[model samples]
Target: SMIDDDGYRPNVGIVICNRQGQVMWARRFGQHSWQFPQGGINPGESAEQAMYRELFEEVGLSRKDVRILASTRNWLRYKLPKRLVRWPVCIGQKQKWFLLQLVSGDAEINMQTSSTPEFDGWRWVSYWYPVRQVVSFKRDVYRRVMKEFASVVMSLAA
Candidate 1:
């Protein structure tokens, strides 16, 4: 709900992976669009705190269900398309992306936990798949984050 002076919303983007090396990919409610689960960071919330909160809120996984693998060292930013910018002060998101390896069973991911859910359903996908399938506005950031996680993600495939 808040934006920085530069007009980027502080946000946290999540990449949840299973032991098998695939990342969790989610579909937005009633839309054909797909993406990794992510959300805005509340004012005064640390990035880690926002990440975990968004994890449970969007995918229904708690802190115990996943292990933090790695995160992009710097904030990754994207600009919203002109037509999609609803607020004058917010252009898009500037996020710290986290990569989490799921430790709990797949059954633990409950998309219906929140009264207003970001995604309707989710499934596991290859590490690079998201870069291709994500919505156009966030495509570059998705590519950047996924590329940063490439080595670790590929290493876990076997």
Candidate 2:
């Protein structure tokens, strides 16, 4: 994927929740790291389009399986810690964050759909779980984004 005009990679963030109000969190392939489903957006694609693509590519939840509940008004930027950046001059990601609710069962999640599987396992957790659980560089974004979507998670479930 290529970077946008600002050297930032255009990205899309997916926050999915099951009926029980438990958010879907996936572990990185062969690693202990767990985070939400997110990916860099391809050129010519809308952020919402990127969301649908990443959702299926990542967790294998089809278009009909999830319903959108909330979306951030603007792209939220996050700079990498240098180590995570492949190019020295490239900035980190600026993602359009979206919140989705699962309308299907857990059976729909298939981590092997992509050529490169990002996760070997997944678990449902509280809405705020990833704020502290994700890598330190991403914590602030998670906290801010989740706060804005918190009411939906509470209202839609329980």
Candidate 3:
């Protein structure tokens, strides 16, 4: 819902890390494909604001449940596959990726909150696993963001 002048939707990508540095990976509902939590940034919301809201909406984790670790300084753009592209409004996503560490709650995830749930199953996985597991179109951005944020995750284990 937050498409810009160039037809790229403003979006936020969230990678949730635990104290052990594993990232949360989710299986999309009714599909075998897995991906990190992500959603469009609504009008008037900042990237940070959208990330926190998406963390809750998609995974049922609130701000109190996680700590903001790091965020990409610039938008990462990816073109949608031609068949999936929506003309006029959405052509692809331009996202700001955020890295968050879970601080308190772990067992509180409820995928039922949203009428149309984004994920059906979830698990902890190595931070780099997602780049290999996500859909092909998203792999490059996933790799870029993970590479940029890997150091921050490693520091948590220090």
Against the reference, the lDDT scores of all candidates come to 0.88, 0.86, 0.88
Name the weakest run of 10 consecutive residues (lDDT summed) in model 2: 82-91
Point to the candidate with the largest TM-score: 1
Tell me how candidate 3 scores on lDDT. 0.88
How does each model score on TM-score? 0.96, 0.93, 0.94
Error of 2 at 8 (Å): 0.8
> Which residue pairs overlap in candidate 2's backbone?
none
Q: Model 1 over residues 39-87: C-alpha lDDT tens digits?
A: 8888888999999999888788889999999999988999999998884
lDDT of 1 at 137: 85
Error of 3 at 121 (Å): 2.4
The residue ranges of model 1 lying beyond 4 angstroms of the native Cα positions read: none
Please list the residue runs of candidate 2 whose C-alpha ends up more than 4 Å from where it truly belongs after superposition: none
lDDT of 2: 0.86
lDDT of 2 at 75: 82
